[PDB]
Enzyme design. Structure first.
Site, PDB file in Angstrom:
ATOM      1  N   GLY A   1      -4.944   7.204   1.587  1.00  0.00           N
ATOM      2  CA  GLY A   1      -3.772   6.529   1.045  1.00  0.00           C
ATOM      3  C   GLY A   1      -3.906   5.027   1.073  1.00  0.00           C
ATOM      4  CD  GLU A   2      -4.029   1.861  -3.070  1.00  0.00           C
ATOM      5  OE1 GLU A   2      -3.861   0.626  -3.194  1.00  0.00           O
ATOM      6  OE2 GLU A   2      -4.845   2.515  -3.757  1.00  0.00           O
TER       7      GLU A   2
ATOM      8  CB  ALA B   1       1.878  -4.143   0.650  1.00  0.00           C
ATOM      9  CE1 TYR B   2       0.914  -5.497   5.034  1.00  0.00           C
ATOM     10  CE2 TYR B   2      -1.040  -6.114   6.283  1.00  0.00           C
ATOM     11  CZ  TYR B   2       0.282  -5.700   6.250  1.00  0.00           C
ATOM     12  OH  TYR B   2       0.948  -5.488   7.432  1.00  0.00           O
TER      13      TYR B   2
ATOM     14  CG  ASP C   1       8.380   1.737   7.983  1.00  0.00           C
ATOM     15  OD1 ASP C   1       9.334   2.181   7.305  1.00  0.00           O
ATOM     16  OD2 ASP C   1       7.294   1.406   7.492  1.00  0.00           O
TER      17      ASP C   1
HETATM   18  O1  LIG Z   1      -1.106   2.797   9.638  1.00  0.00           O
HETATM   19  C1  LIG Z   1      -1.222   3.838   9.010  1.00  0.00           C
HETATM   20  C2  LIG Z   1      -2.237   4.788   9.510  1.00  0.00           C
HETATM   21  C3  LIG Z   1      -2.522   5.947   8.848  1.00  0.00           C
HETATM   22  N1  LIG Z   1      -3.470   6.808   9.212  1.00  0.00           N
HETATM   23  C4  LIG Z   1      -4.470   6.504  10.267  1.00  0.00           C
HETATM   24  C5  LIG Z   1      -4.707   7.617  11.324  1.00  0.00           C
HETATM   25  C6  LIG Z   1      -4.777   8.934  10.599  1.00  0.00           C
HETATM   26  N2  LIG Z   1      -5.323  10.024  11.033  1.00  0.00           N
HETATM   27  N3  LIG Z   1      -5.180  10.989  10.101  1.00  0.00           N
HETATM   28  C7  LIG Z   1      -4.554  10.561   9.087  1.00  0.00           C
HETATM   29  C8  LIG Z   1      -4.252  11.402   7.862  1.00  0.00           C
HETATM   30  C9  LIG Z   1      -5.041  12.541   7.630  1.00  0.00           C
HETATM   31  C10 LIG Z   1      -4.809  13.323   6.494  1.00  0.00           C
HETATM   32  N4  LIG Z   1      -3.817  12.984   5.642  1.00  0.00           N
HETATM   33  C11 LIG Z   1      -3.019  11.907   5.838  1.00  0.00           C
HETATM   34  C12 LIG Z   1      -3.229  11.081   6.952  1.00  0.00           C
HETATM   35  C13 LIG Z   1      -4.265   9.157   9.373  1.00  0.00           C
HETATM   36  C14 LIG Z   1      -3.572   8.113   8.541  1.00  0.00           C
HETATM   37  C15 LIG Z   1      -1.656   6.211   7.656  1.00  0.00           C
HETATM   38  C16 LIG Z   1      -0.750   5.328   7.225  1.00  0.00           C
HETATM   39  N5  LIG Z   1      -0.554   4.136   7.849  1.00  0.00           N
HETATM   40  C17 LIG Z   1       0.406   3.212   7.219  1.00  0.00           C
HETATM   41  C18 LIG Z   1      -0.391   2.152   6.438  1.00  0.00           C
HETATM   42  C19 LIG Z   1      -1.495   2.496   5.625  1.00  0.00           C
HETATM   43  C20 LIG Z   1      -2.234   1.514   4.928  1.00  0.00           C
HETATM   44  C21 LIG Z   1      -1.866   0.158   5.044  1.00  0.00           C
HETATM   45  C22 LIG Z   1      -0.769  -0.202   5.851  1.00  0.00           C
HETATM   46  C23 LIG Z   1      -0.041   0.787   6.542  1.00  0.00           C
END
Ligand SMILES: O=c1cc(N2CCc3n[nH]c(-c4ccncc4)c3C2)ccn1Cc1ccccc1
Ligand code: NI
Length: 329
Positions: A22-23, A25-26, A139
């Site tokens: 995923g992604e 803003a920054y 959040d």
């Molecule tokens: O901060 C985090 C950390 C995140 N993950 C890290 C740890 C993890 N383990 N497994 C997964 C996962 C595995 C399979 N499907 C979905 C997620 C993650 C997702 C996800 C979102 N955001 C918010 C964000 C993202 C980008 C920029 C700013 C903020």
């Protein structure tokens, strides 16, 4: 170095076989293979240095996540950034890889009452730890709730976390407080019960209308606290709205789950249920175990006034905070 959706991901040679998650803003989240631990991990690329606000979030998350240690909260295993401050434009945060998130799960799966109950327990057990450290997440949403193959839950994304989408935002945020997290957990509980967001507002006005359409018109006492004038007047200009009982919206839901939902989705934050009382609610009886619910050793405290700090200074703090993960430290 590998490229994921036109974005460079300089994590090699240790992390390879990259795949998009995923992604924001920054930032962008990918999965990759760790050739040292022989597992797949999650890597979060952050590009925050152009903005002071983005620098504040990055430093807070790094500091909070490195001090915390709880099963229901994501940690930081490694951080990758350039050998020098001048060349550091990105920060890669390495975290445990989970199977999915609640956002993705609720899009494809119907949850059993025992699984809603179990996921809710782990959110509150995680939040019990966070709140005991005198920190608010600020959040909580389904995408920040990670799940593994054996239904273990972890809370991530501590960028907006502080020392004590708008769909999960408490009305007191919209009307200018560990109570805000409870509101979010209430919204999440409601989404687990029906597979749709309870208050899906297109804008804050539409958001407040979605809220009042279910809870009914706010009482005088609820409009008594410090409130934004524009917002207070708007609410005073609206025709009366009746409160929709919880069993009308969730006809099949466990009545105990609806009792707790009601206590969490309270307009007045002062009357809203707290994390410890929510854990003791009859609905969570089969999972509630105060012997197995760790609290923080002492309250979290930042040494400096991060809000007042210029982005160049926040970058230096980020560079020092991340130094321990560099070779030859
Ligand atoms: O901060 C985090 C950390 C995140 N993950 C890290 C740890 C993890 N383990 N497994 C997964 C996962 C595995 C399979 N499907 C979905 C997620 C993650 C997702 C996800 C979102 N955001 C918010 C964000 C993202 C980008 C920029 C700013 C903020
Ligand atoms: Ni399960």
């Amino acid at each position: 170095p590998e490229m994921v959706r036109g974005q460079v991901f300089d994590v090699g040679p240790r992390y390879t076989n990259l795949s998009y998650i995923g992604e924001g803003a920054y930032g962008m989240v990918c999965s990759a293979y760790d050739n040292v631990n022989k597992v797949r991990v999650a890597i979060k690329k952050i590009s925050p240095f152009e903005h002071q606000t983005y620098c504040q979030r990055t430093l807070r998350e790094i500091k909070i996540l490195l001090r915390f240690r709880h099963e229901n909260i994501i940690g930081i295993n490694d951080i990758i950034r350039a050998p020098t401050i001048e060349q550091m434009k990105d920060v890669y945060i390495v975290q445990d890889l989970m199977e999915t998130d609640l956002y993705k799960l609720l899009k494809t799966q119907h949850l059993s009452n025992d699984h809603i109950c179990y996921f809710l327990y782990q959110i509150l057990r995680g939040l019990k730890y966070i709140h005991s450290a005198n920190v608010l997440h600020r959040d909580l949403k389904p995408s920040n709730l990670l799940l593994n193959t054996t239904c273990d839950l972890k809370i991530c994304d501590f960028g907006l976390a502080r020392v004590a989408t708008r769909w999960y935002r408490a009305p007191e945020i919209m009307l200018n407080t560990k109570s805000i997290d409870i509101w979010s957990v209430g919204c999440i509980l409601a989404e687990m019960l029906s597979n749709r967001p309870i208050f899906p507002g297109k804008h804050y006005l539409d958001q407040l209308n979605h809220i009042l359409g279910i809870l009914g018109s706010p009482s005088q006492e609820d409009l008594n606290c410090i409130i934004n004038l524009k917002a207070r007047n708007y609410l005073l200009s609206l025709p009366h709205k009746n409160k929709v009982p919880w069993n009308r919206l969730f006809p099949n839901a466990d009545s105990k789950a609806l009792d707790l939902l009601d206590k969490m989705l309270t307009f007045n934050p002062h009357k809203r249920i707290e994390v410890e009382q929510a854990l003791a609610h009859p609905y969570l009886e089969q999972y509630y175990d105060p012997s197995d619910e760790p609290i923080a050793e002492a309250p979290f405290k930042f040494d400096m006034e991060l809000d007042d700090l210029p982005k160049e200074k926040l970058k230096e703090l980020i560079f020092e905070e991340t130094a321990r993960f560099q070779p030859g430290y």
